[PDB]
Amino acid sequence: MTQSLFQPITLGALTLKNRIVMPPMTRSRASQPGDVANHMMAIYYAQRASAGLIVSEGTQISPTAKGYAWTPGIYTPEQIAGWRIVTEAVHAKGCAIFAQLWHVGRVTHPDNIDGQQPISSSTLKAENVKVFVDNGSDEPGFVDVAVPRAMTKADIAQVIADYRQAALNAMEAGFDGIELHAANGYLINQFIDSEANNRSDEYGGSLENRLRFLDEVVAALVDAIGAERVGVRLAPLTTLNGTVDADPILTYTAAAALLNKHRIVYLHIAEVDWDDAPDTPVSFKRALREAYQGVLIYAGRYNAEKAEQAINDGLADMIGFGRPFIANPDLPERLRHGYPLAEHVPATLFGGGEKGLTDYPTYQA
């Protein structure tokens, strides 16, 4: 019935209104040129500010961290200012918002990163994966990803520096914190998962080595803005974007414990990615609950009943609703009352303008 779902919760120095999270969702509406967050995005997020916490769509930390056309960056002064319009709008509505810092690694195409070859833990191409690019028209052009080059020690230092600076930029933009996207097959995930990492140096070769990049990036983020303002997203079992780990229960319980040592403010588990909804054993969820003792968030095909159950069973503290939030700006109100949920239109998820972004109405009987 959602009683627990509508209980407030403390997140670091913040006190959130409820346990509902608007998870990070790329909409590719950033202004061109410059990939700048804008007015329509500010309206879009403000319309959904009844969530307890909003996590922004992935925002690239550098020119070569981008994987899809028209996603907003968080590395130029103008990009920071664009995000400020968004955070000001969201804060005016009374809501906390974290910026999801993104580096896609090999899940991109040269067209999206100034013609550069993508980087990854190794030279392994993500199999059966596509991204989209700008092709002289306002419709996403889907293309196969490219074969990446393996990161050097210098590349690793550079990316850590880019993440660190992006966190400071997020604070300058008025965000309440940042979420490290270490999930859904992107760069950090390309180091964590065994089948995506063939490195022979200290960043591959053992569980400790595979978690090293995550460890170092998180250490830098925490050093920059404080553990209370750092959340991290992981995807233990989904494999849609090409990353598979041989022993995910061990790898991810270890990762959860490692992140717990950093005292990150929340751990966010991406339980489903599109239609990739692998069985996620309750025993595993309970192990994660013991390994990481901060705020635990899950997202992936949840409805009101399942969300309430997960919280009451002690598996999660907050639950994210992605697709439902796209089509229902007043999703919390609808979940609480049991009002029917509008469904989103796939064709307007990416690119375009306000249509399919800010024109989904609030519920009206």
Ligand SMILES: Cc1cc2nc3c(=O)[nH]c(=O)nc-3n(C[C@H](O)[C@H](O)[C@H](O)COP(=O)(O)O)c2cc1C
């Ligand atoms: C339009 C779209 C874009 C997404 N972009 C991202 C993103 O930028 N970062 C991220 O971590 N997950 C991304 N996701 C995944 C969602 O955050 C969420 O985990 C997923 O949709 C599962 O939840 P749901 O079943 O409630 O929609 C995206 C999903 C949608 C539907």
Ligand SMILES: CCCCCCCCO[C@@H]1O[C@H](CO)[C@@H](O)[C@H](O)[C@H]1O
């Ligand atoms: C106190 C109420 C303040 C409302 C401020 C609304 C500002 C709207 O701003 C407008 O948003 C449009 C997209 O929706 C953009 O296309 C316009 O260029 C932009 O000026």
